[PDB]
């Protein structure tokens, strides 16, 4: 089997991407944030504290003839951005782009943190990291991909995120029309439950490539590119007037600037992030200070190849017995 679904930016900045997901019978379609940095499929629901729901579409398990309470199971998750959610668990039929999993754990939120409430466009998350990170207790549950994998034509999914435009998540096949040149594959460590890999270096604009190993995670659920402070300083030094602002929470730059590109290495291959991808616009409405899309990972504890990086590539998440990651230009 295969599946193919379009993923759509939630706003003009590509702060996140939503993908429609069918849950239950008859289908209830929710727009979920596909997150290769976590491993829970959770949704706003009829059980979510009413004051914490503000415009989201909810899953109502009592209206699904295939929903079953997973007795005794609870979940609770905290994300790197400080947000969180928790609740109980149903199993139900879940379909993405024509690919159907029966008996998928659908984690129903009883509580969500304010950032989730305040984002009316995201109805929940669909985790695509390794199932070892799944938070369901006392019986850990499998991700949608893990459940689907054996049925797929090939045990892979691909992320093809757009810049200020829709893109595609495919399951079970590699669309050879969706990228240019070849796909370069690179080793993955699953030790921390992430799609963790090592970039071979970077360049800023038309500058020389610096060969240096940068361990980090491919994370579709993180907006920005978080890299070591040395790398990030080298980038922003090429933008007149850019500075790290403790009050804003990262590098800012004059909105009048033209940003240089940023290149990262994948083996001997190179992925170029155009400068415009690194612009996250005014820090507040009407400001001439703009927020940068490359930020320091210092104090996160891990480097994160988030959407800023991934949207410059066609990315293969290869879930073979020994997982790997592939990157192509597009």
Curated annotation (Swiss-Prot):
Positions of the Peptidase A1 domain: 17-328
Domain of life of the native organism: Eukaryota
The entry's keywords: Aspartyl protease, Disulfide bond, Hydrolase, Protease, Signal, Zymogen
Disulfide bonds: 255-290
Enzyme class: hydrolase
GO terms for biological process, alphabetical: proteolysis
This enzyme's EC code(s): 3.4.23.22
Catalysed reactions listed for this entry: Hydrolysis of proteins with specificity similar to that of pepsin A, prefers hydrophobic residues at P1 and P1', but does not cleave 14-Ala-|-Leu-15 in the B chain of insulin or Z-Glu-Tyr. Clots milk
Record-annotated active site: 35, 199
A GO term, aspect molecular function: aspartic-type endopeptidase activity
Recorded family membership: Belongs to the peptidase A1 family.
The protein's name: Endothiapepsin
Organism: Cryphonectria parasitica
Gene: EAPA
């Amino acid at each position: 089997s295969t599946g193919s679904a379009t993923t759509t930016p939630i706003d003009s900045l590509d702060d996140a991407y939503i993908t429609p997901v069918q849950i239950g019978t008859p289908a209830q379609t929710l727009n979920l944030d596909f997150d290769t940095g976590s491993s829970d499929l959770w949704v706003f629901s009829s059980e979510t504290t009413a004051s914490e729901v503000d415009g989201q579409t909810i899953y109502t398990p009592s209206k699904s003839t295939t929903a079953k309470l997973l007795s005794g199971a609870t979940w609770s998750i905290s994300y790197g951005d400080g947000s969180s959610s928790s609740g109980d668990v149903y199993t139900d039929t879940v379909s993405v782009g024509g690919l159907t999993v029966t008996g998928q754990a659908v984690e129903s939120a009883k509580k969500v943190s304010s950032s989730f409430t305040e984002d009316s466009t995201i109805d929940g998350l669909l985790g695509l990291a390794f199932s070892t990170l799944n938070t369901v207790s006392p019986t850990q549950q499998k991700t949608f991909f893990d459940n689907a994998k054996a049925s797929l034509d090939s045990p892979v999914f691909t992320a093809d995120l757009g810049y200020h435009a829709p893109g595609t998540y495919n399951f079970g096949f590699i669309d050879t029309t969706a990228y240019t040149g070849s796909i370069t594959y690179t080793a993955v460590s699953t030790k921390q439950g992430f799609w963790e890999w090592t970039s071979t270096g970077y360049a800023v604009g038309s500058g020389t490539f610096k060969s240096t190993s940068i361990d980090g995670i491919a994370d579709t659920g993180t907006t920005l590119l978080y890299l070591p402070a040395t790398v990030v300083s080298a980038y922003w030094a090429q933008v007149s007037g850019a500075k790290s602002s403790s009050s804003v929470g990262g590098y800012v730059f004059p909105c009048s600037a033209t940003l240089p590109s940023f290149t990262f290495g994948v083996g001997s291959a190179r992925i170029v992030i155009p400068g415009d991808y690194i612009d996250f616009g005014p820090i507040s409405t009407g400001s001439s200070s703009c927020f940068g899309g490359i930020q320091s990972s210092a104090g996160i504890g891990i480097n994160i190849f988030g959407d800023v990086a991934l949207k410059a590539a066609f990315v293969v998440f290869n879930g073979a017995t020994t997982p790997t990651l592939g990157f192509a230009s597009k």
